[PDB]
Write a protein that binds this ligand. Structure first.
Ligand SMILES: CC(=O)N[C@@H]1[C@@H](O)[C@H](O[C@@H]2O[C@H](CO)[C@H](O)[C@H](O)[C@H]2O)[C@@H](CO)O[C@@H]1O
Length: 127
């Protein structure tokens, strides 16, 4: 079943669409957690992760590719399919790369990177 949640990463900050804008290609970052819609993510059985009607996708499939939101219908399965493991690893299924934070200061855009089991690579769910 789909579950709506916050995605909580390094230092208890939340995955956040910068500025709250739902336009295609707006990047994601870490931001102090709050009730705003751009921090509410729906994990679906189809493998997508959605906010504001859009899908989390990397802009590419290589280490260091940033993540952003995009139209779920302007995305192929490779772009939009993720798997959140119980230990916190959030894997981009096609590439096997993992969602990785790049700082807790403002506008630190998240990327997909080779898994190093870093503290920047562990994502928890919370109501
Ligand atoms: C036009 C304008 O100034 N809009 C802003 C919003 O963009 C802003 O939304 C927040 O932006 C931060 C990043 O700076 C986070 O993404 C946060 O989750 C958003 O809520 C709001 C609040 O600062 O202020 C204006 O509305």
């Amino acid at each position: 079943v789909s579950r709506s949640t916050h995605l909580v990463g390094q230092d208890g900050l939340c995955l956040d669409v910068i500025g709250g804008y739902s336009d295609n290609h707006v990047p994601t970052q870490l931001w102090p957690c709050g009730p705003q819609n751009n921090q509410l993510w729906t994990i679906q059985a189809d493998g997508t992760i959605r906010t504001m009607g859009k899908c989390l996708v990397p802009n590419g499939h290589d280490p260091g590719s940033y993540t952003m939101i995009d139209d779920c219908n302007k995305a192929d399965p490779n772009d939009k399919t993720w798997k959140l493991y119980p230990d916190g690893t959030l894997t981009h299924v096609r590439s096997s790369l993992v969602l990785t934070s790049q700082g807790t200061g403002a506008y630190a855009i998240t990327t997909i990177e080779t898994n190093t089991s870093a503290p920047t690579q562990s994502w928890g769910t919370a109501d």
